[PDB]
Amino acid sequence: MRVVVIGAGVIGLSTALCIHERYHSVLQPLDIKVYADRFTPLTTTDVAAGLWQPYLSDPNNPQEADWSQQTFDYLLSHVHSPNAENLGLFLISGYNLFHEAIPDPSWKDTVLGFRKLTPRELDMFPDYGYGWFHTSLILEGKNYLQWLTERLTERGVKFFQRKVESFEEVAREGADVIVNCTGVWAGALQRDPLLQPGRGQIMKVDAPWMKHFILTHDPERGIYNSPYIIPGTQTVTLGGIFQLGNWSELNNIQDHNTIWEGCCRLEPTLKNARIIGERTGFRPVRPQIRLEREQLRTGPSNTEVIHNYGHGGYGLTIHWGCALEAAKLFGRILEEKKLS
Amino acid sequence: MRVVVIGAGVIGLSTALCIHERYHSVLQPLDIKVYADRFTPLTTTDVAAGLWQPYLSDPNNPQEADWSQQTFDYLLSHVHSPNAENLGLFLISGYNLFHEAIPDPSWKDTVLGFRKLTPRELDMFPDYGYGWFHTSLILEGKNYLQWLTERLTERGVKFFQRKVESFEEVAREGADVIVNCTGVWAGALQRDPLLQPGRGQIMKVDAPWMKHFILTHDPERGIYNSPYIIPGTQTVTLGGIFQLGNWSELNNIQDHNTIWEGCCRLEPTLKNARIIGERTGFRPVRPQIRLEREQLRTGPSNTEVIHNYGHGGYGLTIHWGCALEAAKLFGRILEEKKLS
Numbered sequence: 277m278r279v280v281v282i283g284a285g286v287i288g289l290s291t292a293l294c295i296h297e298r299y300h301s302v303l304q305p306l307d308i309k310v311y312a313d314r315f316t317p318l319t320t321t322d323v324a325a326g327l328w329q330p331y332l333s334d335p336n337n338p339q340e341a342d343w344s345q346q347t348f349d350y351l352l353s354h355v356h357s358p359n360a361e362n363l364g365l366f367l368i369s370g371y372n373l374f375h376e377a378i379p380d381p382s383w384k385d386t387v388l389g390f391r392k393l394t395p396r397e398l399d400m401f402p403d404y405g406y407g408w409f410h411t412s413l414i415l416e417g418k419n420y421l422q423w424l425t426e427r428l429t430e431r432g433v434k435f436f437q438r439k440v441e442s443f444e445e446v447a448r449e450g451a452d453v454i455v456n457c458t459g460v461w462a463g464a465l466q467r468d469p470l471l472q473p474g475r476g477q478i479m480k481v482d483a484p485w486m487k488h489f490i491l492t493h494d495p496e497r498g499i500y501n502s503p504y505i506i507p508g509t510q511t512v513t514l515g516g517i518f519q520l521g522n523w524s525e526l527n528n529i530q531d532h533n534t535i536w537e538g539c540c541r542l543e544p545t546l547k548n549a550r551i552i553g554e555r556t557g558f559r560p561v562r563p564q565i566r567l568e569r570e571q572l573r574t575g576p577s578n579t580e581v582i583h584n585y586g587h588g589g590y591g592l593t594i595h596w597g598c599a600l601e602a603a604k605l606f607g608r609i610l611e612e613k614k615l616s
Numbered sequence: 617m618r619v620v621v622i623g624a625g626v627i628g629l630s631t632a633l634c635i636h637e638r639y640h641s642v643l644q645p646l647d648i649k650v651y652a653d654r655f656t657p658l659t660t661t662d663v664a665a666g667l668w669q670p671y672l673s674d675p676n677n678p679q680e681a682d683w684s685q686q687t688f689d690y691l692l693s694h695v696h697s698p699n700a701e702n703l704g705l706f707l708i709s710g711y712n713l714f715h716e717a718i719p720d721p722s723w724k725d726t727v728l729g730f731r732k733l734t735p736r737e738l739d740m741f742p743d744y745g746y747g748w749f750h751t752s753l754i755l756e757g758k759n760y761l762q763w764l765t766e767r768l769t770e771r772g773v774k775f776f777q778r779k780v781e782s783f784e785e786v787a788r789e790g791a792d793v794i795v796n797c798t799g800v801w802a803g804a805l806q807r808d809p810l811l812q813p814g815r816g817q818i819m820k821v822d823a824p825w826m827k828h829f830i831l832t833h834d835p836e837r838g839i840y841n842s843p844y845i846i847p848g849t850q851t852v853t854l855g856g857i858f859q860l861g862n863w864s865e866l867n868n869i870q871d872h873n874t875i876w877e878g879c880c881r882l883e884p885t886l887k888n889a890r891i892i893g894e895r896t897g898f899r900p901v902r903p904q905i906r907l908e909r910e911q912l913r914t915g916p917s918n919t920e921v922i923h924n925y926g927h928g929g930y931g932l933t934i935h936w937g938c939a940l941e942a943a944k945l946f947g948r949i950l951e952e953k954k955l956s
């Protein structure tokens with residue numbers, strides 16, 4: 277079999293790797309290609325801070341809940357391992373803040389040592405009245421992409437820097453199975469109106485002492501529009517911007533100020549911090565992760581599609597569970613092509 | 617009314633700073649001046665990471681528990697302060713790891729959100745079977761001294777670098793009150809058998825993805841002789857050395873390997889971090905911290921001396937509670953020339 281994986285981002289490569297390993301033995305000519313328009317230092321997966329944390333409420337798909345959990349376990353089972361450094365993986369604890377009470381999550385047991393905030397801690401953040409504290413994981417995308425690649429290279433997966441214009445284009449030229457892991461730009465390959473870019477702008481600042489992450493939440497501002505502070509590895513991440521259908525990949529001076537003024541008030545130790553950089557990204561926002569098969573129709577023979585897009589603000593967080601599901605379905609494509 | 621402080625350690629500098637900040641207004645002739653043999657970077661303080669954590673067992677003079685409490689409350693009310701970054705202050709969470717079940721401390725209700733560890737967390741550390749988790753503070757010496765330095769210099773205080781040979785020597789030139797902060801080298805000023813140095817070595821290393829502290833305990837080989845990893849502000853601190861009566865102030869090759877071999881087994885990710893510095897200090901070990909007031913005999917009439925030394929491996933932890941008692945003691949003296 278010949279396999280083509282469009283998309284060289286976290287979703288795309290995790291899959292390519294996870295499809296390889298699993299069916300490397302039970303398939304003679306398993307030849308995986310990756311096509312993509314922007315590689316590892318230039319994707320939406322790079323803009324992400326990579327903090328493990330799914331939506332605050334149940335998604336339409338509870339098949340999703342298990343997925344983010346699946347990633348977390350795999351990740352934590354490799355935090356205290358040599359690779360972890362190359363992976364951009366490590367533990368990180370922090371505050372989740374609200375303006376009022378609110379039910380627990382779902383990942384409640386998934387995350388490590390989940391517990392409610394205490395009065396005495398709340399004091400440190402005047403503007404808020406209720407919140408949480410727990411231990412999670414950060415999977416930095418720049419080290420993850422880099423690692424996944426080297427992993428995929430030794431496996432023999434080749435990479436090509438081409439903008440696919442159509443599944444047919446690839447089918448018609450030899451593709452047996454096509455994995456669409458093309459995120460927020462999946463639209464151009466197949467009109468999807470439920471897939472919108474929730475615009476993200478962030479700030480990378482040098483403030484080492486920051487050791488705890490601080491996501492806040494206010495209903496009037498909106499999902500990921502409430503300020504957050506995620507100390508990464510070599511720098512700490514300011515951010516808190518969410519804007520649907522704003523395909524504007526460019527830093528906004530007015531956003532800058534709402535991130536700055538916003539996070540400062542949260543932790544004024546920040547005011548005399550240092551701005552290393554400012555970046556913009558698009559959360560592939562969609563009601564529920566598109567993870568399913570499709571039957572594209574051509575000249576002679578029909579070719580399968582495995583769609584893997586729309587993870588929005590929780591890409592890194594749910595990546596594996598999905599990349600490991602997509603492989604699941606890929607084995608179903610083989611049983612059907614009768615091979616075994 | 618001349619005051620002479622000897623020792624520009626955390627104890628010296630902090631005490632010398634309350635005596636002023638809290639009396640400069642009530643004494644037209646208030647003269648504070650500190651003498652020291654070793655300044656800013658060459659004190660024991662400098663070798664300390666500065667993690668606020670007393671001893672597991674209760675303090676001997678039950679007043680100390682109260683002083684630590686005072687420290688963590690003055691520190692915690694300034695964690696988000698305009699100066700928090702200067703003082704070298706920041707919150708930080710982490711693990712204690714015991715081999716067996718072991719009673720709670722007593723400061724449990726003074727740190728931020730104490731609690732036992734779940735078994736999934738104990739899976740991070742195979743060698744161990746039981747532990748604690750909580751948020752705390754780090755007061756880096758290298759910067760906490762430099763802070764107190766400037767606060768003092770603008771407050772009129774003067775620093776002179778000289779190796780005081782005797783108490784008389786100071787009295788002779790007109791020391792009305794002498795506040796002794798000599799710490800470990802206190803012995804050679806007024807013989808003390810109970811004040812011993814527990815020599816300590818550490819290792820500063822480059823591993824930014826460290827976010828929690830990991831203090832292991834191993835009663836096998838006594839106090840502090842178990843690895844620990846305290847992430848600093850610029851660099852992470854390895855270590856786990858307690859050696860009583862060792863006045864050797866030079867790094868040891870077998871200590872280096874103990875610091876390394878031993879720390880890595882805890883956090884294997886460390887097996888790759890770059891080594892930045894190795895230093896050595898002496899913990900002012902003494903059955904119970906010498907904070908009192910003695911009437912020092914000097915020829916004709918007297919010259920007052922306040923003792924404040926022997927703060928074990930928890931100088932920083934309790935530094936403040938003392939600097940505030942000692943000024944209280946500087947009050948009782950000031951009320952015996954019978955002044956309002």
Ligand SMILES: Cc1cc2nc3c(=O)[nH]c(=O)nc-3n(C[C@H](O)[C@H](O)[C@H](O)COP(=O)(O)OP(=O)(O)OC[C@H]3O[C@@H](n4cnc5c(N)ncnc54)[C@H](O)[C@@H]3O)c2cc1C
Nearest residue numbers: 285313314321324326327440458459476557590591592593
């Ligand atoms: C500010 C911000 C903060 C975030 N923080 C977090 C966080 O803390 N935790 C978290 O889990 N997630 C976070 N995310 C989001 C997360 O990073 C993404 O959801 C995850 O990267 C989606 O994987 P992906 O879709 O980005 O793969 P992508 O990066 O979208 O893959 C894109 C690649 O596919 C290629 N491609 C697309 N279409 C075609 C085509 N037609 N032909 C050829 N190639 C094509 C593109 O050229 C591109 O190179 C954040 C996002 C933003 C914007």
Ligand SMILES: Cc1cc2nc3c(=O)[nH]c(=O)nc-3n(C[C@H](O)[C@H](O)[C@H](O)COP(=O)(O)OP(=O)(O)OC[C@H]3O[C@@H](n4cnc5c(N)ncnc54)[C@H](O)[C@@H]3O)c2cc1C
Nearest residue numbers: 623625653654660661664666667780799816897931932933
């Ligand atoms: C390896 C190590 C790790 C540690 N980690 C921690 C930690 O995480 N948290 C914590 O709280 N504590 C820690 N400590 C210990 C803690 O830092 C010390 O207890 C605290 O620094 C004591 O303040 P001090 O008494 O040393 O002031 P000092 O450093 O004792 O003041 C010393 C100064 O006084 C001068 N002096 C003394 N006698 C005279 C004299 N006769 N004339 C003139 N000058 C004189 C000296 O020359 C010197 O300049 C650690 C210690 C070590 C060794």
